[PDB]
Design a protein around this ligand. Structure first.
Ligand SMILES: CCCCCCCCCCCCCCCCCC(=O)OC[C@H](COP(=O)([O-])OCC(O)COP(=O)([O-])OC[C@@H](COC(=O)CCCCCCCCCCCCCCCCC)OC(=O)CCCCCCCCCCCCCCCCC)OC(=O)CCCCCCCCCCCCCCCCC
Ligand SMILES: CCCCCCCCCCCCCCCCCC(=O)OC[C@H](COP(=O)([O-])OCC(O)COP(=O)([O-])OC[C@@H](COC(=O)CCCCCCCCCCCCCCCCC)OC(=O)CCCCCCCCCCCCCCCCC)OC(=O)CCCCCCCCCCCCCCCCC
Ligand SMILES: CCCCCCCCCCCCCCCCCC(=O)OC[C@H](COP(=O)([O-])OCC(O)COP(=O)([O-])OC[C@@H](COC(=O)CCCCCCCCCCCCCCCCC)OC(=O)CCCCCCCCCCCCCCCCC)OC(=O)CCCCCCCCCCCCCCCCC
Ligand SMILES: CCCCCCCC/C=C\CCCCCCCC(=O)OC[C@H](COP(=O)(O)OCCN)OC(=O)CCCCCCC/C=C\CCCCCCCC
Ligand code: HEC
Ligand code: HEM
Ligand code: HEM
Ligand code: HEM
Ligand code: HEM
Ligand SMILES: COC1=C(OC)C(=O)C(CC=C(C)C)=C(C)C1=O
Ligand SMILES: COC1=C(OC)C(=O)C(CC=C(C)C)=C(C)C1=O
Ligand SMILES: COC1=C(OC)C(=O)C(CC=C(C)C)=C(C)C1=O
Ligand code: FES
Lengths: 159, 194, 354, 92, 108, 48, 354, 92
C-alpha cells in the first residue's frame, strides 16, 4: 500500500503537479489547486495519497537484507535446456521451412527433436520426492585434512 | 584424499609443434557453444571481431552478432535502449549478474568459459574429458535432483546436466552430430577462445 | 666508465680451467635484464586496476603482446632455475670458504628475489594468487596490527595490489645495484677454480670467456624459446586463470614451483611460527657453514656425499609440496627436515684429533 | 596458464585415417564412444573386479554406510585412458 | 561484511534446544563442536553464510534439520550451523563479533 | 564525511535515511531500494 | 663509496667568496629527491585508470594524503623556480664560457625536466590537462602516423595515460644519474667565483659551505611551507579540477606557469612549425653563446645590460601567455621575439677591431 | 587547485560586529544586498554614465545591431566590489 519512505508518493504528487501546470500554461486553461476537479485541482488525489502515506512505519530507516523465502527451483536447469532446444529447432525450421515447427512436442521423439531433453525434465521432477532423502555424499574429506596448510586454513585475513 | 582424477591425453591436432588450430573444428565448436553452452555460460572476454577472418568471414560474423539483442545507451533522453549486436560486442551473457545465474542453477554458478580451456589441470583435455565423463553414480553414491555424477569434476557431483546428446544440433558442414564430436569441437573452440 | 669497462671486461683475467658451471652467473645477469625490460614494457599496456582483464587485453589486443606476457612469466621460472643452480654449484665447490663476501652479496640478492616473485603473481588478479597472499600475510598475524598496515584493508583488495606493485617495480632496480656490489667482490676477490689451489693459467675475458659464455647462453635460449612458444614444461599453475571469488577456496593453495621448498616446510611443521622459523633457518644457516672450521683446508673436491644428499633433500621437499596435505607425506616430510638439520650440522662441526 | 603441453608430432599419435561412425537401424549415427565402452571395460577388467567386489561388500553391511567411489574412479580413469587412444579416429 | 554474507539469526527456544540436543551427540559429527562454543548468546547465531564445500550461500529454514540447506550439492546444516549431511566438510565459520549492548553487535 | 565534523552521527543517519538508494542484486539477482546509510554518496537527481 | 663521499663532501674545497646564488644547486638536488619520494609514495594510493577520482581519494580518505598531494604539486613549481633561477645566475656570471661541459650536462637535465613535468600534469586527468596534450600532440601531426603511435588511439584515452605514466616514473631516476655527471664535472672543472680570476681562498665544504647551504634551504622551506598549507600564491590552475569532457573546450587551454614562455612562442608565430622551431631555438641557441668569441676575456662583471633585457623578455613572454589571444598582445609579443633574436645575436657575435 | 589564497587576518577585513537585516512592513527580512545596491551604484557612477550613454547610442541605431554588455560588465564589477566590502557585516 504505502512505502516505508514516502519519497515515492511525494514524487508522484510532484509529477502530477508539474504536468498539470505545464498543461495549463501551454493550453491557457485554468490552473487552481485545491479547487473544483473539473476545471482545476487535477492533482488533488495524489496530494491526499502522500498525506495518507505519512502514516509511515516504526524505524523505517533500519532496512535489513534477507535470503529469499523460496530456494532455487527444482529442475530449472533441465527446463532451460529444453527451452533452448525448442527455440533452436524453431529457428532452424522457420529458416529451412521444415515441418519440425509443427509437432514441437512429440511422444515418440520422431516428430520432436526436443523430446529427449523434455523427458529429462520430467524425470527430475518425478524423482524429486524419490531422492528427497538422498544423502548426496560420496567421499567427504575428514575435518583434520580439511583444516591443514594448503586447505581451509589461514583463509581469512587476520587468522 | 586424492586430487580430482587427471584427464586423459587426447590427440588434438594443435598439440604438435608445427600444427595450427583446426579451423573447421573451431567453427563447429562455435555452433556447439552458441546452441548448448551459451544458455548457462557466458564468454565475456570473447568478442565477435575476434572471429572475423579467423573462424568466419566478416559478413557471417555480422549476421551472428545481429542475431542477438544488447542493451546500449543512454539515449538523448537518458534512457536505455535495445539494439542488434555488432562486431565490437562481447558474446551475449545469459544472466544479468552472478546472483541471477546462481538462482537458475540450484545455487551453482556457471563459470565464464573465456579462459576455462586453461583454468583447469589438464587444460583442453579437461574439457573433453568432463563433457564425456558423465556416468551412472558409483555404488553407494546417491545424488539429489539436479546433481549428476562426473568422474573428472572435483568431488564427483556436478550441478550441470549432461549437456551433449546425440542429434542436439545439426552441423552446417554435415559432420555427424554425436556427443563425442560436439565435445571434441567445443573443446577445440574454447581452446582457441582462450 | 669506458676505462672501468676495459678493466673489468677486456683486460679481466680469469683461469682457463673453469667449467660451464662458471657461466651460470652471466646468464643470470642477462636474463635479469630481460625481465626488467619486459616488465617495464608490459606496464605500458596494463596497470593495477584489474589484472585479470589486463592480461587478457595484452594477449588478445596488443600486437605481439603474447610474447611479452609469456616471456615475463617464463623468464621468471628461468631466473629462479639459474639462481638455484648457481647456489648448488657454489655449494659443490665450496666457494663460500674464502669468498664469503661474494656469498653474502649473493644472498642479499636472493632475499630480494624471493619478494619480487611472490608479489608479481598477485598482479595477475588470479584465484591462486589471491588466496596464497591471504595465507602468507596471516603468518605475521601475531605481530599486532601489522597485517592491516601491509594489506591496507581487512581483506586483500585493490589497495593491497596498488602498493605491492610499487615494490615490484622498484625492488628489481635495487637488485641490479647489488649485482654491481657482487661483481665488485668477484673481481677483487678472485674467482675460485676447479682446482683447490691458485695457478698462473689466467686468460683475458672478452676474447675467450665471453665467447664461451655466449655459447652457453645461446644453448639455454634454444631451450627457453621452445618453452616460451610451446609450453613443453608446465611451469605455471592453471588455477591462476580463474577469476577471484573470495567465498570459494581453490582446490589447492600452492605457490609457484620455486616456493614449494618453503611451502612444504610451512605445511609440515605443526606450529605456524615454527614453520616460519624453519624457513628462516634455511636461508640463514647456509651463510655460516665454514665459520666454525679450524683446519687449513677448504673441504673441496672430496666425494661431496653430504652435498648430494642436500640437493636431493631440496628436490624431495618440492615434491611433497605439490602433494596434498596427506598424513603419510607429512610424516615422511618431517623426517626429511630432521635429516637436513643433521646434514647441516655435519657441515658446521669442526673435527677433533684422533 | 596454457591449455596443452607441446610435443613433437611423432609423440602425438594423431589418427592417420577416419572411420565414419556406424549407423543404427533407425539411421541415427551411434556414438563411437558408446561402442568403445565395452571394449575398454574389458581392458580394465582388473579394476572392474575390484569395484564389483566393493559393491558386494557394501551390499552386505546392514547399516546404510559404504560407498565404492574410490574404486569406480580408478576404473573410470582406466576406461577413459583406453578411449583416448582410439576415439578421435572416429571423429572428424 | 568484508565481502561475505553474514547470517544473523534470532533463534527460537525450539531452535536453541535442538542444537543443545545435538550437543550431547557431539563426536558423532563430522566437525565436533558444541553450540556453546559457536554462540555468545543462545538467542543469537551470527555465522558466515558460505557453504564449506564450494562456497555457495546456503538458504535458511531448509534441509532436514530446518537449519540451512545449500542447494548446490545438498549440504544440510543444523540450527547451530554444524554440518550434518551432504558433501560439505566442516561447519559454517563463526565471524569475529562482540555484543556492544543487549540490542547491538559489532562485526569486526 | 559530515559525521563529527558538521553534524553529529545520529543526525547524519537521519539525513541519509531520508533518501532512497538502489542497491543489489538480491539472492534472486534483482535490484532493490533501501534507505541510505553513512557510507552512501550524496543522492544524484538524474541517472545520467 | 665512503672515501668518494669524503673526497666530494668533506675534503672538497670551494672558494670562500661565493654568494647565496651558489646555493641554488644544493636546493635543486634536495627538492628533486623530495619530488621522487613523494611521487613514489603517492603512487601507493593512486589509480591511473581515473586520476581525477584518484586524487580525490588521496585528499579525502588517505591519512595525511593531502600533504602528499600538495607537496608533489607545489614542489614541482619549486623545482622549476630554482632551476630557472639557476640558469639566470649562470647567464649573469657567464659560467658557460669555461665550464661548458657543466652547462651541457645541465641542459640535458633541463630537457628531461621539461618532459617529466608536462606528462605529470596529464596524470591529473582534468580538463586542462586533457586538452593541453591534445593540442601539443597535434604539433607533430605532420610526421605521418606518429601521433597514433604516441597516443595509442585516435584520441587521448587511458591508453595514453598508462604509457606516459611509465615515462613519468622512470625518467626522474635517469635525471638523478645525469645529476651525478653534473656534479662530476663541477668537482673536476672547479666552480666559478664572484671574481673573474682564480684565487687561493678555498675552504672545505662540510664545515662551512654546507652550513650556509642549509641556512638557504631552510629559508626557502619557511616560504614553501606557507604555500604548501595556505596557497599564498596561485601556482596551479583551477580548471584542472573539472571532469574531462571531450565535447566542450576549456575557457583557456594553457599550461602550468613554467611552460608559458614556450606556449606564447607557439601562439604568437603564425605558422605552427615556425612556433615549434622557435621553441627549439630557445633551448638550443643558449648552448653556443661563447663559441664564436675570440678575445681573451669571459665578458664577465660588466654592467650585463644585455642579460637584464633577456631576463625581462622571459617574464614578459610569460605574461603574454596568460593573456587571451587578443590581437594587440600578439603584435607586441612578436616584437619581443624579434628583440630576443637580436639580444641573442649580440651575445654570439665576435667583435672587430677599431 | 584550492579555493582561496591565505592572508594575515590583519589583511582580511572580517566584520567586527553584526547588524541584523532590516525587517519589512510585512515582516519579512529584506536582503542586505538589495538595500546596498543603490549606494554602491552611486559609488560607481562614472561607469554607470558610460553604460547609460551606450544605451542611448544603441537606441538611435535604426538597424537592430548594438549591445552594451561591455560597459555593463564594468559597472557590475564595480558595484560588486563595493558590495563585497560591506555585505558580510549584515550576514551571520
Ligand atoms: C644419479 C647421478 C647423481 C650425480 C650426478 C652428478 C653430480 C655431480 O657431481 O655433478 C655436479 C656438477 C659438477 O660435476 P663435475 O664432475 O665437476 O663435472 C662437471 C662437468 O665436467 C662440466 O663439463 P663441461 O665444462 O664440459 O660442461 C658440460 C657439462 C655441463 O653439464 C654439467 O655440468 C653436468 C652436471 C651434472 C649432470 C648430471 C646428469 C645425470 C643424468 C643421468 C640421466 C640418466 C637417465 C637414465 C634413463 C633410463 C631410462 C630407462 O655437460 C656434461 O658434462 C654432460 C655430461 C653427461 C650428462 C649425463 C648424460 C646421461 C645420458 C644417459 C643416456 C642413457 C642411454 C640409455 C640407452 C639404452 C638403450 C637400450 O656441478 C655441480 O656441482 C652442480 C651442478 C648442478 C646440478 C647438480 C645436481 C645434483 C643432483 C642430481 C640429481 C639427479 C636426479 C635424482 C637422482 C636420485 C633420485 C632418488
Ligand atoms: C623506506 C626506506 C628508507 C631507507 C633509508 C635509508 C637511509 C640510509 C642513510 C645512510 C647514511 C650514510 C651516511 C654516510 C656519511 C659518510 C660521511 C663521510 O664521508 O665520512 C667520512 C668520515 C671519515 O672519518 P673522519 O676523517 O674521522 O671524519 C671526517 C669528517 O669530518 C667526519 O664528519 P663531520 O664530523 O665533518 O660531519 C659529521 C656530520 C655532521 O653533519 C652536520 O652537522 C650537518 C647535518 C645536516 C643534516 C641535513 C639537513 C637537511 C635539511 C633539510 C631541510 C628541508 C629540505 C626539504 O656530517 C656528516 O657526516 C656529513 C653529512 C653530509 C650531508 C650532505 C647532504 C645533506 C642533505 O667518516 C667515516 O668515513 C666513518 C663513518 C662513515 C659513516 C658511518
Ligand atoms: C602586531 C604584530 C607585529 C608583528 C611584528 C613581527 C616583526 C618580525 C621581524 C623579524 C625581523 C628579522 C630580522 C633578522 C635580522 C638578522 C638577519 C641575519 O642574521 O641574516 C644573516 C643570515 C645569514 O647569514 P650570513 O650568510 O652570514 O649573511 C647573509 C648575507 O650575507 C647578509 O646580507 P643581507 O643583509 O642581504 O641578508 C639579508 C637576507 C636577504 O635575503 C633575501 O632577501 C633573499 C631573497 C632575495 C630577493 C629579494 C627581493 C626583494 C624584494 C623587495 C620588495 C620591497 C617592497 C617595498 C615596499 C615598501 C612600501 C612602503 O639574506 C638572507 O636571509 C639569505 C637567504 C639565502 C637564501 C638562499 C637562496 C637564494 C636564492 C637566490 C636569490 C633569490 C633569487 C630569486 C629572487 C630574485 C628577485 C629579483 O640571514 C638569514 O638567514 C636571515 C633570514 C631572515 C631575513 C630577514 C627577515 C625579515 C622579516 C621581517 C618580518 C616583519 C613582519 C612584520 C609584521 C607586522 C604585522 C602587523
Ligand atoms: C633440436 C630441435 C628443437 C625443437 C625444434 C622444433 O620445435 O622444431 C619444430 C619442428 C617440429 O614440428 P613437428 O610438429 O614435430 O613436425 C613433425 C613432422 N611434421 O621441426 C622441424 O620443422 C624440423 C626440425 C628442425 C630443423 C631445424 C633446421 C635449421 C637449424 C639447423 C642448425 C644446424
Ligand atoms: C557446452 C557444451 C557447455 C560447456 C563446454 C560447459 N558447460 Fe557447464 N556448467 C553448468 C553449471 C551450473 C556449472 C557449475 C556447477 C558446479 O560446478 O557446481 C557448470 C560448470 C562448467 C564448467 C566448469 C567445471 C568446474 O570444475 O568448475 C565447464 C568447463 C563447463 N560447465 C562447460 C551448467 C551448464 C548448463 C546448465 C544447464 C549447460 C547447458 C552447460 N553447463 C553447458 C556447458
Ligand atoms: C641475483 C642473483 C645472482 C647473480 C646475478 C649472480 C651473479 C654471479 C656472477 C656473475 C658470478 C661470477 C661468475 C661465476 O663464477 O659464475 C657469481 C659468483 C658467485 N656467486 Fe653469485 N649471483 C647471484 C646469486 C648468488 C647467490 C644467492 C649466492 C649465494 C648463495 C651467490 C654466491 C656466489 C659466489 C660464492 C660466487 C663466487 C663463485 C666462485 O668462487 O667463483 N650468488 N655470481
Ligand atoms: C627480479 C625481477 C623480476 C621478477 C623475478 C618478477 C616476477 C614476476 C612474476 C613471477 C610475475 C607473475 C607473472 C604471471 O602473472 O604469471 C610478474 C608480474 C609482473 N611483473 Fe614482474 N618481475 C620482475 C621484475 C619486474 C619489473 C622490473 C617490472 C616493471 C615495473 C615488472 C612488471 C611486472 C608486471 C606489470 C607484472 C604483471 C603482469 C603479469 O602478470 O605478467 N616486473 N613478475
Ligand atoms: C623531476 C621529478 C618530478 C617532477 C618534476 C614531477 C612532476 C609532477 C607534476 C607536475 C605532477 C602533477 C601534479 C598535479 O596533478 O597537479 C605529477 C604527478 C604525479 N607524479 Fe610526479 N614528478 C616527478 C617525479 C615523479 C616520480 C619519481 C614519481 C614516482 C613514480 C612521480 C609520481 C607521480 C604521480 C603518481 C603523479 C599523479 C598524482 C598527482 O597528480 O599528484 N613523479 N608529477
Ligand atoms: C636538474 C637541474 C640541475 C641541478 C640538480 C643542478 C645542480 C647544480 C649544482 C649542485 C651546482 C654546483 C653548486 C652551484 O654552484 O650552485 C651546479 C653548477 C652549475 N650548473 Fe647546474 N643544476 C641543474 C640545472 C642546470 C642547468 C639547466 C644548467 C644549464 C643551463 C646548469 C648549469 C650549471 C653550471 C654552468 C654550473 C657551474 C656554475 C659555476 O661555474 O659554479 N645547471 N648545478
Ligand atoms: C602464493 O605465493 C606463495 C606462497 O603461497 C602458499 C608461499 O607459500 C610462499 C612461501 C612463503 C613463506 C613465508 C616461506 C611464497 C613466497 C609464495 O609466493
Ligand atoms: C634453499 O634454496 C633453495 C635452493 O638453493 C640451495 C635449491 O637448490 C632449491 C632446489 C632447486 C631445484 C632446481 C630442484 C630450492 C627450491 C631452494 O629453495
Ligand atoms: C599545454 O601547452 C604546453 C605548451 O603550449 C604550446 C608548451 O609550449 C609546452 C612547452 C613545450 C616545449 C617543447 C618546451 C608545454 C609542455 C605545454 O604543456
Ligand atoms: S557448495 Fe554447498 S553443497 Fe557444494
Amino acid at each position: 500500500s504505502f512505502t516505508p519512505t514516502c519519497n515515492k508518493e511525494l514524487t508522484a504528487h510532484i509529477d502530477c503537479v508539474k504536468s498539470f501546470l505545464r498543461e495549463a500554461r501551454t493550453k491557457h486553461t485554468p490552473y487552481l489547486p485545491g479547487t473544483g476537479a473539473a476545471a482545476a485541482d487535477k492533482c488533488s488525489g495524489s496530494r491526499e495519497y502522500f498525506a495518507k502515506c505519512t502514516m509511515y512505519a516504526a524505524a523505517t530507516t533500519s532496512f535489513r537484507r534477507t535470503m529469499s523465502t523460496e530456494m532455487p527451483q527444482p529442475c530449472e536447469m533441465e527446463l532451460n535446456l529444453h527451452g533452448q532446444c525448442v527455440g533452436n529447432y524453431l529457428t532452424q525450421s522457420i529458416r529451412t521451412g521444415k515441418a519440425a515447427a509443427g509437432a514441437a512436442r512429440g511422444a515418440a521423439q520422431s516428430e520432436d527433436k526436443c523430446f529427449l531433453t523434455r523427458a529429462a525434465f520430467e524425470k527430475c521432477m518425478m524423482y524429486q520426492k524419490i531422492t528427497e532423502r538422498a544423502t548426496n555424499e560420496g567421499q567427504v574429506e575428514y575435518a583434520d585434512f580439511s583444516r591443514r596448510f594448503g586447505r581451509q586454513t589461514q583463509t581469512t585475513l587476520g587468522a | 584424499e586424492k586430487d580430482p582424477p587427471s584427464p586423459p591425453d587426447w590427440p588434438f591436432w594443435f598439440k604438435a609443434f608445427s600444427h595450427c588450430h583446426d579451423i573447421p573444428s573451431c567453427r563447429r565448436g562455435y555452433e556447439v557453444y552458441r546452441q548448448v553452452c551459451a544458455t548457462c555460460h557466458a564468454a565475456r572476454f570473447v568478442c565477435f571481431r575476434h572471429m572475423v577472418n579467423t573462424i568466419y568471414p566478416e559478413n557471417r560474423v555480422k549476421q551472428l552478432a545481429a542475431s542477438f539483442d544488447y542493451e546500449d545507451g543512454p539515449n538523448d533522453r537518458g534512457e536505455m535502449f535495445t539494439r542488434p549486436g555488432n562486431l565490437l560486442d562481447p558474446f551475449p551473457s545469459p544472466y544479468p549478474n552472478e546472483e541471477a545465474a546462481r538462482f537458475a542453477n540450484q545455487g551453482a554458478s556457471p563459470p565464464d568459459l573465456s579462459q576455462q580451456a586453461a583454468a583447469h589441470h589438464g587444460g583442453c583435455d579437461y574439457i573433453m574429458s568432463l563433457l564425456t565423463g558423465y556416468r551412472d553414480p558409483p555404488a553407494g553414491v546417491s545424488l539429489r535432483s539436479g546433481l549428476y555424477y562426473n568422474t573428472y569434476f572435483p568431488g564427483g557431483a556436478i550441478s550441470m546436466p549432461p549437456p551433449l546428446n546425440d542429434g542436439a544440433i545439426e552441423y552446417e558442414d554435415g559432420t555427424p552430430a554425436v556427443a563425442s564430436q560436439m565435445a571434441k569441437d567445443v573443446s577445440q573452440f574454447l581452446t582457441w577462445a582462450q | 666508465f669506458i676505462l672501468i669497462i676495459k678493466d673489468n671486461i677486456i683486460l679481466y683475467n680469469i683461469n682457463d680451467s673453469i667449467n660451464y658451471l662458471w657461466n651460470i652467473g652471466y646468464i643470470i645477469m642477462v636474463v635479469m635484464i630481460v625481465q626488467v625490460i619486459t616488465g617495464i614494457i608490459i606496464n605500458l599496456y596494463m596497470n593495477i586496476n584489474n589484472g585479470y582483464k589486463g592480461i587478457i587485453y595484452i594477449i588478445k589486443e596488443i600486437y605481439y603482446g603474447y610474447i611479452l606476457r609469456y616471456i615475463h612469466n617464463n623468464n621468471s621460472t628461468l631466473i629462479y632455475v639459474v639462481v638455484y643452480l648457481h647456489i648448488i654449484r657454489n655449494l659443490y665447490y665450496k666457494t663460500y670458504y674464502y669468498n664469503i663476501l661474494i656469498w653474502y652479496s649473493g644472498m642479499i640478492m636472493l632475499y630480494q628475489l624471493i619478494i619480487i616473485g611472490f608479489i608479481g603473481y598477485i598482479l595477475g588478479w588470479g584465484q591462486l594468487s589471491y588466496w596464497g597472499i591471504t595465507v602468507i600475510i596471516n603468518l605475521i598475524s601475531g605481530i599486532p596490527y601489522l597485517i592491516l598496515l601491509i594489506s591496507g584493508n581487512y581483506y586483500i583488495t585493490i589497495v593491497t595490489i596498488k602498493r605491492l606493485y610499487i615494490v615490484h617495480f622498484i625492488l628489481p632496480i635495487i637488485l641490479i645495484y647489488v649485482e654491481i656490489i657482487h661483481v665488485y667482490y668477484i673481481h677483487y676477490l678472485i674467482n675460485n677454480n676447479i682446482v683447490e689451489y691458485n695457478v698462473n693459467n689466467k686468460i683475458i675475458f672478452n676474447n675467450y670467456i665471453l665467447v664461451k659464455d655466449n655459447n652457453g647462453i645461446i644453448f639455454i635460449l634454444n631451450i627457453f624459446i621452445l618453452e616460451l612458444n610451446n609450453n613443453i614444461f608446465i611451469i605455471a599453475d592453471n588455477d591462476n586463470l580463474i577469476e577471484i571469488n573470495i567465498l570459494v577456496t581453490p582446490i589447492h593453495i600452492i605457490p609457484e614451483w620455486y616456493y614449494l621448498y618453503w611451502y612444504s616446510i610451512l605445511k609440515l611443521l605443526p606450529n605456524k611460527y615454527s614453520g616460519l622459523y624453519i624457513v628462516v633457518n634455511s636461508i640463514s644457516i647456509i651463510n655460516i657453514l665454514s665459520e666454525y672450521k679450524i683446519v687449513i683446508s677448504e673441504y673441496k673436491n672430496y666425494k661431496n656425499i653430504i652435498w648430494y644428499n642436500q640437493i636431493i633433500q631440496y628436490i624431495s621437499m618440492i615434491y611433497i609440496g605439490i602433494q596434498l596435505p596427506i598424513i603419510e607425506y607429512i610424516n615422511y616430510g618431517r623426517y626429511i627436515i630432521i635429516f637436513n638439520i643433521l646434514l647441516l650440522i655435519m657441515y658446521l662441526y669442526p673435527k677433533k684429533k684422533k | 596458464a596454457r591449455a596443452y603441453c607441446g610435443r613433437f608430432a611423432f609423440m602425438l599419435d594423431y589418427p592417420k585415417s577416419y572411420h565414419p561412425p556406424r549407423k543404427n537401424e533407425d539411421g541415427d549415427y551411434v556414438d563411437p564412444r558408446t561402442d568403445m565402452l565395452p571394449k575398454c571395460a574389458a581392458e580394465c577388467s582388473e579394476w572392474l573386479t575390484e569395484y564389483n567386489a566393493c559393491v558386494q561388500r557394501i551390499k552386505m553391511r546392514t547399516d546404510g554406510r559404504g560407498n565404492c567411489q574410490g574404486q569406480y574412479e580408478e576404473f573410470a580413469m582406466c576406461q577413459d585412458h583406453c578411449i583416448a587412444h582410439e576415439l578421435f579416429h572416429y571423429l572428424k | 561484511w568484508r565481502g561475505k554474507p553474514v547470517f544473523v539469526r534470532r533463534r527460537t527456544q525450539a531452535m536453541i534446544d535442538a542444537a543443545t540436543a545435538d550437543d550431547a551427540i557431539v563426536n558423532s559429527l563430522r566437525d565436533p563442536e558444541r553450540d556453546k562454543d559457536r554462540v555468545k548468546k543462545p538467542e543469537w547465531l551470527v555465522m558466515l553464510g558460505v557453504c564449506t564445500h564450494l562456497g555457495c550461500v546456503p538458504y535458511p529454514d531448509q534441509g532436514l534439520y530446518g537449519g540451512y540447506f545449500c542447494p548446490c550439492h545438498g549440504s544440510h546444516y543444523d540450527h547451530s550451523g554444524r554440518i550434518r549431511l551432504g558433501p560439505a566438510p566442516l561447519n559454517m565459520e563463526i565471524p569475529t563479533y562482540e555484543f556492544t549492548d543487549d540490542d547491538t553487535i559489532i562485526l569486526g
